[model samples]
Target: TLSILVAHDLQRVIGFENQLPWHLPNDLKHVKKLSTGHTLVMGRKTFESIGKPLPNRRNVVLTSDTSFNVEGVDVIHSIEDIYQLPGHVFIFGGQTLFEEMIDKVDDMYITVIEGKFRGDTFFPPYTFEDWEVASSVEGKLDEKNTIPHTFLHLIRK
Candidate 1:
């Protein structure tokens, strides 16, 4: 199954200048917990943003350039080239890939940050009309973090 991992604000803004707008330590820990032992796939830019293959997971990068390669990461030309995994196949993003694969996603792991944020890039426009919330949990905020967050597990209706 294909699932997506993302954190977005009220405006559905997920990124600003190739990085997340928030510095939520708990959310980062949540990502590690959910994505570990899964096949994590991302676009070239997303891979570049992280600068290395995520540990304990099979990292796959989608790029059109045939010459593109990263020592420990599998490079695929298109999203279709990736086969299904026994565990979970997670789509980590950078705008274009999300738009390309959103229709095929079976589930979504979204951390909805409560505050509004300024971002140059956003999660693609999607309606909850076709999606049903499978689960939801509130995230704890620390002194360093002022905004509240809700973690949602959504499945296609």
Candidate 2:
């Protein structure tokens, strides 16, 4: 199955200056928990922003730049290449990639932060009417994670 893992603010902002606009440790932990054994597919800029391949997951980068190469990650030049990958695949970052893969996704794991944030990248416009919430959990605010957030697992209906 293909899935998308993302975190966005109330305004649907996902990134700021190539990095996350908020510091939410628990959200990062949530990402690691669900994606640990899955294949993570991301755009070139997203991979670059992360700086390295995340541990314990198969990292695949989709880029139009044929010369793009990363030592420990796999690179594919087209969106069609995604269909060939086996097991659960997680589309993991950047606005363009999310926009391209949204229609192909079977499930989505979203962390909706409570407030609007300053950001340059936003999550693509998607209607939740086509999906059904499978589960939801409200994140507890702590010293490390200050914002109110909710984790939602939605499956395509």
Candidate 3:
């Protein structure tokens, strides 16, 4: 099971910030590399952030608009439709979707970034006694930077 992973502020778990907006350090690079050829599920707002379709993976955008369309991407009006696609289904953000699908995932990969910035969007805190860590990759602190980061993998029991 893949759980939705997010980082909030020092006071809380904030997934995104206003200052850097979409500039998520280097983890996204790894995510993109790992997710290549996998299915990515995201809401319309998240899809809009991308502005276009991803090259290799098929993007499934959740929208009730009923008129959305693109060449490489498919659109789903509801969350239940997301799992119908093949391969790993990675949720790409927009808080509401996370709330809806968090419990249903089998495994989760979380990048625990170092700094905690103020943010508008957020992903709620979740801890399952059965959701044990499978693996993790913690990066060394950037010598001069204040923020630090680590990677953790969790799979549901």
Candidate 4:
């Protein structure tokens, strides 16, 4: 199955200057939980942002630049390479990759942060009418943080 894993704000912002806009430890753990054993598909920029391949999973990077290479990860010149893979396929991001694969997502695991933030990158806009909430859990804020959040699981209807 194909799935999407993302953490976004109320304004759908996911990034700022190519970096994550917030420090939500629980949300990071949530993403790790879901993607640990799956094959992650991401763009070159996403791979560069992380600086290295994530341990315990397959990382498939999509890029048009043939000269770009990383020691521990696999690379595909086009997005179609992921379509032929086996088992679970998860799309991790850098805006452009998510936009390219948005319509084909079968399930989405989204972490909705409690507040709006200023960011240059945003999650692609989409209508939720075709989706059904499968599960949800409220998150807590610690002494250092001011916002509470929710983790939601949605399946396409």
Better of 1 and 4 by lDDT: 1
Ranked candidates (lDDT, high to low): 2, 1, 4, 3
Candidate lDDT scores, in order, read 0.88, 0.93, 0.68, 0.86
Residue 97 of model 2 has an lDDT of: 90
Looking at model 1, report the run of 10 residues with the lowest lDDT sum: 78-87
Worst 10 residues of 2 by lDDT: 122-131
Q: State residue 116's C-alpha deviation in candidate 2, in Å.
A: 0.7
lDDT of 4 by residue, 39-133 (tens): 99888888888889999889989999888778778889877787887899998987998898888889888888878899998889866798899
Candidate 4 steric clashes: 0
After superposition on all CA atoms, how large is the RMSD of candidate 3?
2.9
lDDT of 2 by residue, 62-129 (tens): 99988888788999999999999999999998899999988889999999999889999999877779
Q: Candidate 3 residues 1-157, lDDT tens each?
A: 2445443344444444322333455665666776788778878877787688777887789999978987777999987797677767787666777778777887777677656665677666767586788987875555443356667777887
- The stretch of ten residues in a row with the least summed lDDT in candidate 4 is 140-149
lDDT score for candidate 2 against the true structure? 0.93
Best by lDDT: 2
User: In model 3, where is the ten-residue run with the lowest total lDDT?
Assistant: 14-23
Kindly list the per-residue Cα lDDT of model 1 for residues 43-85, writing each as its tens digit: 9989999999989989999999899977999888866786644
Indicate the TM-score of model 2: 0.97
Q: By how many angstroms RMSD does model 2 differ from the true structure?
A: 0.9
